Amino acid sequence: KVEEILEKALELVIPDEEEVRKGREAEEELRRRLDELGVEYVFVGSYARNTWLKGSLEIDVFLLFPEEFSKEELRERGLEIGKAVLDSYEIRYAEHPYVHGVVKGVEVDVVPCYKLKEPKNIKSAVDRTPFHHKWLEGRIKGKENEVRLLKGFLKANGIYGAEYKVRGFSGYLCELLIVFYGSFLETVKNARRWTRRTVIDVAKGEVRKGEEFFVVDPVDEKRNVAANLSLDNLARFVHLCREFMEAPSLGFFKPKHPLEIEPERLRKIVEERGTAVFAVKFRKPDIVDDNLYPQLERASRKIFEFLERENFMPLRSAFKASEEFCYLLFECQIKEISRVFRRMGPQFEDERNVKKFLSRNRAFRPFIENGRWWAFEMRKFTTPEEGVRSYASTHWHTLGKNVGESIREYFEIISGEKLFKEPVTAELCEMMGVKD
RNA sequence: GGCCCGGGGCGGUUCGAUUCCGCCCUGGGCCAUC
């Protein structure tokens, strides 16, 4: 039963004694170093609140700087401090650069920010974190394991990140939720009633109907904590909660198995479907995933839209990325279509336009049907692939800034066996609902 | 970078385009980076 299950579960979410110990002693040292320099700092994030998921140990040391300090100063002093304190560093990037390193074996993020008073004055997302922490530390105390359960559950099902490769629940949203419902289970139970118009005002302990799923930030009533949660990911969670409660099981916290498929069986199935399955391959632009995937979606969407207005009847689109290349995957109901198609002309009494419409030299002689004129025109292409080869070659600039630029210099359309031999077999099966 | 809203020019397509497909400059808002 749920309880017995959640019990066996804490085991997969809570960091064991050694992963914890490792943490403390790393924070211990990290503390000394920072003081033997008299720097004004503050640990934030899931480490400072013991809400960190097992296996995801990382520390977040935020450096407080006067308001008056310039942007440049912040990062320079931040770069210096980070460098001196970290065993081994690495200048990372975001809204502004910050430093990432390791201390006594554990991960560390040394972010520079402005010491501020009261939410307004907020100069960057990072400035807001300190407030999020002060508001969260006193209220989440004693429920950390509820937070963890809720992450292992979301992480296990592929919707734990808030970044563009996940579009799911952010760890912050997770604690706010636990602070609202009181525990994992209560969150799971209530989530089942969530709709796309549900709004959760943590500060008001109230739930209301809005225009979109909105979890108003305690620190900023205008900020949506679940802003980048995809409408489909929300749907998948609402369902996942409904099923968990129907049949509790430790399997919900266990990362689903990769489940490889033999390319041969994939071939058979596509045949059983008798659809057009092809891919658009091009070199992976060298850019962070936060810029790459929002592009892959656009590109994939722009082509899907080309395919349907072109009468190829697309079923679903998808995409995969590698160290090497990127793939846009499509499946259609039409492997081929006739050359001729019917073009709609003016009504019979509009002498002006009628004449014009008839003034074009076509090959088949237009006709009248139910009051208006029509014409038989020929298509430029007759198969999905044939069309996308044309679309990608001329409309490359609309598939994203980067993706669009790598397609402009090189792209190929694969299909048949050649396609099943590309590292995209898994994605396809997920796209076709192939079950097993 | 991506999404939402808006201005100013254009190109292709169409009997017919503000309205479909796209391109230039361009104002504001939001999202991820912790």
From Swiss-Prot:
GO terms for biological process: RNA repair; tRNA 3'-terminal CCA addition; tRNA surveillance. Mg(2+) binds at E58, D60, D109. ATP binds at S46, R49, H132, K151, Y160. A single active site specifically recognizes both ATP and CTP and is responsible for their addition. In contrast to the eubacterial homologs, the specificity of the nucleotide-binding pocket is determined by both the enzyme and the tRNA. Catalyzes the addition and repair of the essential 3'-terminal CCA sequence in tRNAs without using a nucleic acid template. Adds these three nucleotides in the order of C, C, and A to the tRNA nucleotide-73, using CTP and ATP as substrates and producing inorganic pyrophosphate. tRNA 3'-terminal CCA addition is required both for tRNA processing and repair. Also involved in tRNA surveillance by mediating tandem CCA addition to generate a CCACCA at the 3' terminus of unstable tRNAs. While stable tRNAs receive only 3'-terminal CCA, unstable tRNAs are marked with CCACCA and rapidly degraded. Belongs to the tRNA nucleotidyltransferase/poly(A) polymerase family. Archaeal CCA-adding enzyme subfamily. This is CCA-adding enzyme. It comes from Archaeoglobus fulgidus (strain ATCC 49558 / DSM 4304 / JCM 9628 / NBRC 100126 / VC-16). The gene is cca.
